[PDB]
Amino acid sequence: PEVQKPLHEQLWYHGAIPRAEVAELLVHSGDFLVRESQGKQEYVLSVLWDGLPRHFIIQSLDNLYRLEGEGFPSIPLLIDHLLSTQQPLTKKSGVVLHRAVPKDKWVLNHEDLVLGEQIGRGNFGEVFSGRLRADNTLVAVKSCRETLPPDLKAKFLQEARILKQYSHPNIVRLIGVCTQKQPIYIVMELVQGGDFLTFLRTEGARLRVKTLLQMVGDAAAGMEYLESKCCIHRDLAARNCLVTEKNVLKISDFGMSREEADGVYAASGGLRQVPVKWTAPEALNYGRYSSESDVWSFGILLWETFSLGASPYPNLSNQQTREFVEKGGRLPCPELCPDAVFRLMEQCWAYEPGQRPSFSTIYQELQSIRKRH
């Protein structure tokens, strides 16, 4: 029976989840969960009341857990008491429990995972290879440095929030989220061939034009899917795409990605290390991100592909690149780039976002070009 299970096996115990996720989960008055305060090193009962989460420290003495009333030898017993009696958590607050909010299917225990070697560094910190102990599934593990500013750490679970919703052959699969203890991890499929930029540079002259077109076609299919889900990626670049053992491309690094039903994300203005040279002018100038700015990014990706991993605007700083683009400046046609592909790239970088092609158009055009290779 449930109440006899340890706290760490309870459906309504959410461990090290951050406050922003708590606020997401607590929807109706009386919705609650129990978690660990990483700072205070105490258990906390978080409950929605008058529209906002309220956080109550669970006291312990003589191995009995309590608030301002009776004590119990376990937190599940305390929770059962409060729920069954409908007693306010404190006389002063009047807060009453109504509904235990359970973990979703994506939560993974730390004990389910073994971390391997570092494979990358992202904006939040290191990315590791790893394995699931139950079956030896190889995984990629995204971590978050503790010293990052609170406002940025609050964005760490965005990649998981987004990828939980998706399933497509050209988008990296989420496996789980390790939020029951610190350190918190996001666990994804391991795409064994690594990043596409390194692939282009390493395999270089071995790659046939037909293969290059299939790989950017994969990217285009991934982007068409994301658009269909109202997802604006914002960080599309060759180095953020991964290559499988069979040279299938998958889009990765969703940390910046935003879901917007009406198709436009207005940036905070506070983003650091913005990928300027991959970003559309309206996105930088006015903070307007959309699938149309992702199309701009896609044009840069196409340039990266057909240059076999050249660095864009190599003789310009980020500020100089913005000034260059405002003057009409664009990247030159790579030697190996078919005329039709360059024409498409040029359309991706139309100054006005409304003049850029759709991802469906891009995918169909790339496919038609490949069929003559």
Numbering used by the authors: 449 to 821
Original paper wording:
We investigated the structure of a polypeptide from human Fes comprising a linker region N terminal to the SH2 domain, the SH2 domain, and the C-terminal kinase domain.
The initial structure of unphosphorylated Fes SH2-kinase revealed an active conformation, which was stabilized by two sulphate ions that mimic binding of a pTyr ligand to the SH2 domain, as well as activation segment phosphorylation. In addition, a sulphate ion is coordinated by Y713 and R706 in the activation segment, thereby mimicking autophosphorylation. The SH2 and kinase domains form a stable unit linked by the N-terminal region of the SH2 domain and polar interactions between the SH2 domain helix αA and the catalytically important helix αC. The N terminus of the SH2 domain (462HGAI) intercalates between the central SH2 β sheet and the loop region between strands β4 and β5 in the kinase domain. The second major interaction site is formed by a network of acidic residues located in the SH2 helix αA (E469, E472) and R609 in αC of the kinase. This arrangement suggests that the interaction between the SH2 and kinase domains positions and stabilizes αC in an active conformation, as indicated by the salt bridge formed between the active site lysine (K590) and the conserved αC glutamate (E607), as well as by low B values in loop regions linking this helix. The activation segment in active Fes showed significantly higher temperature factors than in either of the Fes-substrate complexes, indicating the stabilizing effect of substrate binding.
